[PDB]
Amino acid sequence: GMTEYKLVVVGADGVGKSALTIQLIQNHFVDEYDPTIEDSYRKQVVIDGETCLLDILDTAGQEEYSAMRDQYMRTGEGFLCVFAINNTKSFEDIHHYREQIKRVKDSEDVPMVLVGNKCDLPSRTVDTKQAQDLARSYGIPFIETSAKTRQGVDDAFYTLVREIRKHKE
Ligand SMILES: Cc1cccc2cccc(N3CCc4c(nc(OC[C@@H]5CCCN5C)nc4N4[C@@H]5CC[C@H]4CNC5)C3)c12
Ligand SMILES: Nc1nc2c(ncn2[C@@H]2O[C@H](COP(=O)(O)OP(=O)(O)O)[C@@H](O)[C@H]2O)c(=O)[nH]1
Ligand SMILES: [Mg+2]
């Protein structure tokens, strides 16, 4: 029938987590989506021939380490770690997010994809090589995306799904 996959999109404010989600769910580019709104969206898609129900959590709110957020977050089976290629700070923050995932899953190997969004922008302060290097040090895939032009968006989420399959073996 279906396989459900619980995905969680994380990373710093403004990198495009909402835009990426809404682009996948609803196929349009949201210009100014309330930065404080956290919610889950569900989507039925076929990926490599398998009909999937993607439960996607788009994180937002205040920074804080509360027990039910911990429990909200550890239901994730796979994590999109998103930075913007024009936001150096958001790239440097990726390690903190991967540490928070590792802690709440209590595991050293959690399915994860590194995503460099806003790749449609000319102002590029994070190189591709810098991000690939980080991705290879985690053993995880890296993809560049643009929620505005939709390039790479579907691939980034399906690639994560694929990482969840391999983890399951
Ligand atoms: C993201 C995440 C993944 C897995 C488990 C988690 C468990 C608890 C909490 C988390 N999350 C909550 C939001 C957040 C978080 N960590 C930051 O780190 C910002 C800077 C970087 C270095 C430390 N810190 C000073 N920021 C968060 N916020 C998001 C993005 C900005 C901020 C406010 N709006 C939404 C942590 C878990
Ligand atoms: N040029 C460009 N702008 C983007 C892209 N993705 C998001 N944005 C814009 O960046 C801002 C923050 O996006 P949002 O999805 O709210 O980021 P979030 O805080 O991670 O949810 C919004 O103004 C978006 O229109 C992109 O791929 N390219
Ligand atoms: Mg948002």
Numbering used by the authors: 0 to 168
Question: What did the authors write?
Answer:
The oncogenic impacts of the KRAS gene were first reported in 1980s, making KRAS one of the first identified oncogenes. Clinical data have implicated the driver mutations of the KRAS residue Gly12 (G12), and basic studies have shown that such mutations impair both this enzyme’s intrinsic and GTPase-activating protein (GAP)-stimulated GTP hydrolysis activity, promoting oncogenesis. Despite these progresses with inhibitors of KRAS(G12C), the most prevalent and oncogenic G12 mutant variant is KRAS(G12D), which is estimated to impact more than 50% patients with pancreatic ductal adenocarcinoma. We successfully developed a series of small molecule inhibitors of KRAS(G12D), which function by inducing an allosteric S-IIP and forming a salt bridge bonding with Asp12 residue, as confirmed by crystallographic studies.
Given the axial position of the methyl group, we employed a cyclization strategy based on TH-Z816 and generated the bicyclic compound TH-Z827. As TH-Z827 showed a more than eight-fold increase in potency (IC50 = 3.1 μM), we subsequently adopted a ΔS-focused cyclization strategy and designed additional bicyclic compounds, among which the most potent one was TH-Z835 (IC50 = 1.6 μM). Compared with TH-Z816, bicyclic compounds TH-Z827, TH-Z835, and TH-Z837 had unfavorable ΔH changes yet favorable ΔS changes, indicating that the binding affinity (ΔG) increase of these bicyclic compounds can be attributed to ΔS improvement. In these two inhibitors–KRAS(G12D) structures, the electron densities were well-defined for inhibitors, Asp12, and both GMPPNP and GDP. Our data confirmed that both TH-Z827 and TH-Z835 are able to interact with Asp12 and form a salt bridge for both GDP-bound and GMPPNP-bound KRAS(G12D). SOS-catalyzed nucleotide exchange assays also showed that TH-Z827 exerted a nearly 10-fold stronger inhibition for KRAS(G12D) than for KRAS(G12C) (IC50 = 2.4 μM vs IC50 = 20 μM). The results showed that TH-Z827 blocked the KRAS(G12D)–CRAF interaction with an IC50 value of 42 μM but did not affect CRAF’s interaction with KRAS(WT) or KRAS(G12C) at this concentration.
